[PDB]
Amino acid sequence: PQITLWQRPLVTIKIGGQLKEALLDTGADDTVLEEMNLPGRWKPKMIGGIGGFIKVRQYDQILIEICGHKAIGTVLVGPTPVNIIGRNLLTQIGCTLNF
Amino acid sequence: PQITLWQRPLVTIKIGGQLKEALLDTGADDTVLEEMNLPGRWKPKMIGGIGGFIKVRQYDQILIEICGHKAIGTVLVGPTPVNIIGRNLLTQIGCTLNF
Numbered sequence A, B: 001p002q003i004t005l006w007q008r009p010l011v012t013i014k015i016g017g018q019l020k021e022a023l024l025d026t027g028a029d030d031t032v033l034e035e036m037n038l039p040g041r042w043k044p045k046m047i048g049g050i051g052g053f054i055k056v057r058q059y060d061q062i063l064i065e066i067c068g069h070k071a072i073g074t075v076l077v078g079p080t081p082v083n084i085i086g087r088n089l090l091t092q093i094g095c096t097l098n099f
């Protein structure tokens, strides 16, 4: 659907059989989720934001359903304060900014 | 215009007579710019992201032109690694997410 930005653009996501809320985040290159068990192989990685950097686990080719749209991509897991859906997955669900 | 997300959604802004590049950032509540002279009164403030917090100067009722759309609102100035246009200004230029 189309969404305005008067409130945080939070959507429901389903990943690893679990239901979560996550922020559609055009300022995030990558998707980063708070601590959870994703099954399979991962690689250590560091991502930076405002305030500095966090260590994350990088999981590749993970299936996520974002507000009813399925995407398969890289998910990072670590101590982000908020679940964020980044451009790597936004592109797959055909998400655009409009003004 | 309409903007896809294969690349960072970077736009030209004009603020305090200066031309800068800034990221349209639906994951940011606030607009935060890197160090610059904004004229007038400010207040100390702290904002948090991934990796922790930064101290910023809060300037109210600042005029910004974002990709040719004028907005007046709060601008935060501080050691963000990237100029980010947040929802406080995105709403004023009628910016929407669609998928």
Ligand SMILES: CC(C)CN(C[C@@H](O)[C@H](Cc1ccccc1)NC(=O)O[C@H]1CO[C@H]2OCC[C@H]21)S(=O)(=O)c1ccc(N)cc1
Residues within 6 Å of the ligand: A023, A025, A026, A027, A028, A029, A030, A031, A032, A047, A048, A049, A050, A082, A084, A086, B025, B026, B027, B028, B029, B030, B031, B032, B047, B048, B049, B050, B081, B082, B084, B086
């Ligand atoms: C994490 C969000 C809930 C909030 N952040 C906005 C977010 O878009 C930042 C915006 C951002 C962009 C660049 C550098 C720092 C912060 N992106 C970000 O942290 O993304 C990380 C995930 O992938 C990587 O892509 C870029 C940074 C990494 S934030 O920068 O911390 C932020 C917080 C509060 C305000 N008022 C403004 C911005």
